[PDB]
Amino acid sequence: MTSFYKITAYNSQALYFWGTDADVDRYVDWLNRDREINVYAAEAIPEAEWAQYEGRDDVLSGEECGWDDFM
């Protein structure tokens, strides 16, 4: 169910997420809600690379309660 996700957009800063794909999709939708250009899209990161994301401070975690309060 849950995975690390890399969320990218042309000419934009990469974002990083941990959680379910339903939650990464809600997150991407909120990121794009007012993006006229260079919209974001997510890709699921294979477990082989997961160490390079675990504990990272730029990874928004959907498994934390209230992570989506700003939505």
Considering Cα of 42, then 48, then 54, then 57, what sign does the dihedral take? negative
Considering Cα of 57, then 31, then 67, then 46, what sign does the dihedral take? negative
C-beta of residue 34 within 8 angstroms of C-beta of residue 40? no
C-beta of residue 24 within 8 angstroms of C-beta of residue 42? yes
Considering Cα of 70, then 5, then 11, then 38, what sign does the dihedral take? negative
Helix (H) or strand (E) holding 69: none
C-beta of residue 9 within 8 angstroms of C-beta of residue 39? yes
Distance CA 37, CA 66 (A): 29
Domain definitions of the chain by residue range: 2-61
Q: Which of 49, 61, 54, 50 is nearest to 24 (CA)?
A: 61
